[PDB]
C-alpha cells in the first residue's frame, strides 16, 4: 500500500545505481528518506529492502543502529546540539537555554507545529567554534540568543 513518490523513488534508484553493489546504498537511501519525510516512516522500510534486495530485518537493524535516523518524530528542521566535552566547556548549556527561550522546547522534544526538533549529539568536529549546532545540514557557532534567533528566522 505504501509507495515512494516518483520524485523520491528516482533519487533512491540513483543511489542504488551509484556503488557497484546495491546494498552499499542503504545509508544514502535512508538519508534521502529522512530528508523527504522529516523522519524514517516504518512503512518505508519494506519497499526500500526490496529495492536494495536485502531482507527487511537487515534494513530495520541498520536504521536502529545509526543514531542520525529517527523513526519516532517528524520534524522539518533538526537542531543538532553538540553535548560533548569542548562544547560543554565553552557553553552548550547557554545554547540550550537560548533554544528553550526562542522555541519553548528542550532536547528530544519537537515544537507543536512540527517545525523544530532539538537533537543532542556527540562532537560535530567543529570544536574550535564551540558551542556548535546544526540546523539540518547547516552548521554554526552559537554566539548569543539574539544571534541564534536571527539564524533560526532563516528557516521557515
Amino acid at each position: 500500500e505504501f509507495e515512494f513518490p516518483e520524485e523520491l523513488k528516482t533519487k533512491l534508484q540513483e543511489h542504488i545505481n551509484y556503488f557497484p553493489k546495491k546494498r552499499q546504498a542503504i545509508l544514502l537511501c535512508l538519508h534521502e528518506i529522512q530528508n523527504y519525510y522529516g523522519y524514517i516512516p516504518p512503512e518505508s522500510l519494506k519497499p526500500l529492502a526490496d529495492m536494495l534486495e536485502l531482507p527487511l530485518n537487515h534494513v530495520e537493524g541498520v536504521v536502529a543502529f545509526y543514531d542520525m535516523f529517527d523513526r519516532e518524530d517528524k520534524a522539518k528542521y533538526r537542531i543538532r546540539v553538540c553535548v560533548s566535552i569542548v562544547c560543554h566547556l565553552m557553553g552548550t548549556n547557554k545554547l540550550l537555554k537560548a533554544l528553550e527561550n526562542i522555541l519553548g522546547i528542550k532536547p528530544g522534544e519537537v515544537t507543536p507545529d512540527g517545525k523544530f526538533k532539538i537533537v543532542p549529539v556527540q562532537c560535530l568536529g567543529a570544536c574550535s567554534e564551540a558551542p556548535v549546532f546544526m540546523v539540518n545540514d547547516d552548521e554554526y557557532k552559537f554566539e548569543s540568543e539574539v544571534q541564534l534567533n536571527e539564524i533560526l528566522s532563516r528557516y521557515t
Binding site: 551509484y18 556503488f19 557497484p20 553493489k21 546494498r23 552499499q24 546504498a25 542503504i26 545509508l27 544514502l28 535512508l30 538519508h31 536494495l52 536485502l54 537487515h58 537493524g61 541498520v62 543502529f65 545509526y66 543514531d67 542520525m68 535516523f69 543538532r80 553535548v83 560533548s84 566535552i85 569542548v86 560543554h88 566547556l89 565553552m90 549529539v121 556527540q122 562532537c123 560535530l124 568536529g125 567543529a126 570544536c127 574550535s128 567554534e129 564551540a130 556548535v132 546544526m134 539540518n136 545540514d137 547547516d138 552548521e139 554554526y140 557557532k141
Partner: protein
C-alpha cells in the same frame, strides 16, 4: 552552493597541507591547477607502483588517524596479497576535539583526491572509497563536485592520462556512529551493514572490503602523498625531525585565545602549540590539563613533550583540548565517559556494560548521589572495560579517565569526601 560551515581558523608554518586550506572557502580545480596541482599525479603515473610505495616508505610517513602505523609498510602488506584490491579514505573524524580532516575536505578537496589517486595506483586499486561521517554534509557535496571536476579533467575514469590505470572514487556517508571510524566497522558499513568491528588479524590489507586486500588510510595521511611524489621522499624527510618527518595538523580547542588548526612540524612541543601558536590561554589562566581528544590526559607538568609519535611524545591525532585552572576535571571526565557510553557498538560484554556503567556511576559521583559501593564499582568498571574487546574503543574507554584519577587525585577526593 553548499551548507553553512563555521569558519575554523587555520595557520601554517610549512605552507603544505594548509597552503590553500588556510583560507576558509572551497578551492576548485582551476585554483588547484594554478598551484601546480595534479602534476604530482602525472609524475606518479610515470613511475611504477612499487617505486611509489618505496618513496612513501622512505618518507617515514605514518598514519595520521591515531595509531601512527607506517604508511608505506601498510601498502607493502596489501600488495603482497592477490587482487583485486581496494583503497579507502577514512573521513569519519568523530573523536571529541578532532576537526583537522574536515578543513582539507571542505577547502582543498583536490589535495585529498590527488592523494587518493596516487595511493590507489600504488596498491593497484581500481576502486576507491571516501567514507565521510553523516554530520559532514557540506564535505560530502564538496567531494562529489570535486570528483566530477577531476573526471572532467581526465584525472579519474578509465586509462587515466594514457597510463592504462583505471579508477573510480565512490563517496559513502556515515549516519551517526563513531565506531564506523574504526577501519573494520567502516568496511562493514561500506558493505551496507551495521558498524560492527571485526576481529583483527586479519588486518584489512589481507582481508577487507568483500574479503579483498584493502588499505584504509586517514584523510590527513593521504593528503601528504602528493607532496612526497612532488618533492621526492628525501626532501619530504627534511621537514621537521628526521625520525618523525613531514607536516602535521593540530586541531586546538578549549581555553585558548586562537582555537583552530595549526600545520606545524612534529618537533613542536605541546607548550609551543598552546602559547607560541594558539595565543596562550583565555584570560591568561594557568593550564590545568590537555585532553588528547578522548584518548589521553596530560597535566601542566607534561607540556614540554614533542608533538610526535614517540613513546614520550603526544601521539594520537595531535588533538589538543586545553582546560584551565577553573575547569572541573571530574565534570570533564564525565563528558568523556558519556562519549564512550554513547558510542560502544555493544558486541563485547565488558565494553557494552562497562562503557554504560562508567558513565552511569560517574554521573552519580558528579551529582553527589554516589554510594560507597558506587564509588568502588566505578573504580572497578573503569579498570575492566578492555577485557575480551575486539577493537580499540574497549581498549581505551577507561584510559583518559584513569589518567585523571592518577594525575588529579585531590579533585576526585573532593567529590568522594
Amino acid at each position: 552552493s553548499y551548507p553553512a560551515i563555521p569558519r575554523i581558523y587555520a595557520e601554517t608554518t610549512l605552507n603544505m597541507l594548509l597552503k590553500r586550506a588556510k583560507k576558509p572557502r572551497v578551492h576548485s580545480i582551476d585554483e588547484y591547477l594554478k598551484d601546480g596541482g595534479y602534476q604530482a599525479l602525472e609524475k606518479a603515473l610515470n613511475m611504477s607502483p612499487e617505486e611509489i610505495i618505496d618513496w612513501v616508505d622512505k618518507s617515514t610517513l605514518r598514519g595520521r588517524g591515531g595509531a601512527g602505523f607506517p604508511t608505506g609498510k601498510k601498502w607493502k602488506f596489501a600488495v603482497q596479497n592477490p587482487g583485486p584490491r581496494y583503497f579507502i579514505c577514512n573521513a569519519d573524524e568523530s573523536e571529541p576535539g578532532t576537526f583537522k580532516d574536515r578543513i582539507i575536505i571542505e577547502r582543498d578537496p583536490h589535495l585529498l583526491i590527488e592523494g587518493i589517486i596516487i595511493s590507489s595506483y600504488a596498491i593497484g586499486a581500481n576502486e576507491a572509497y571516501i567514507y565521510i561521517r553523516g554530520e559532514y554534509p557540506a564535505g560530502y557535496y564538496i567531494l562529489r563536485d570535486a570528483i566530477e571536476e577531476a573526471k572532467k579533467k581526465g584525472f579519474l575514469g578509465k586509462n587515466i592520462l594514457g597510463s592504462g590505470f583505471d579508477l573510480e572514487i565512490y563517496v559513502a556517508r556515515g549516519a551517526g556512529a563513531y565506531i564506523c571510524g574504526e577501519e573494520t566497522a567502516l568496511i562493514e558499513s561500506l558493505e551496507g551493514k551495521r558498524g560492527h568491528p571485526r576481529l583483527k588479524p586479519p588486518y584489512p590489507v589481507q582481508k577487507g572490503l568483500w574479503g579483498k586486500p584493502t588499505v584504509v588510510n586517514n584523510v590527513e595521511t593521504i593528503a601528504n602523498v602528493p607532496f612526497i611524489i612532488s618533492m621526492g621522499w628525501e626532501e619530504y624527510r627534511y621537514i621537521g625531525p628526521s625520525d618523525y618527518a613531514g607536516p602535521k595538523l593540530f586541531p586546538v580547542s578549549g581555553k585558548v585565545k586562537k582555537p583552530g588548526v595549526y600545520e606545524l612540524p612534529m618537533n613542536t612541543t605541546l607548550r609551543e602549540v598552546i602559547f607560541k601558536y594558539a595565543g596562550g590561554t583565555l584570560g591568561n589562566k594557568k593550564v590545568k590539563a590537555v585532553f588528547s581528544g578522548a584518548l589521553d590526559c596530560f597535566s601542566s607538568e607534561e607540556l614540554d613533550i614533542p608533538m610526535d609519535y614517540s613513546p614520550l611524545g603526544f601521539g594520537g591525532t595531535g588533538t589538543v583540548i586545553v582546560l584551565t585552572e577553573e575547569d572541573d576535571i571530574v565534570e570533564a571526565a564525565l563528558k568523556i565517559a558519556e562519549f564512550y557510553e554513547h558510542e560502544t557498538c555493544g558486541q563485547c560484554t565488558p565494553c557494552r556494560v562497562g562503557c554504560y556503567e562508567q558513565a552511569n556511576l560517574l554521573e552519580k559521583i558528579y551529582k553527589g548521589e554516589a554510594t560507597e559501593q558506587d564509588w568502588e564499582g566505578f573504580d572497578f568498571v573503569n579498570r575492566n572495560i578492555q577485557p575480551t574487546s575486539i577493537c580499540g574503543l574497549g581498549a581505551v574507554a577507561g584510559r583518559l579517565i584513569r589518567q585523571t584519577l592518577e594525575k588529579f587525585p585531590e579533585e576526585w577526593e573532593k567529590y568522594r569526601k
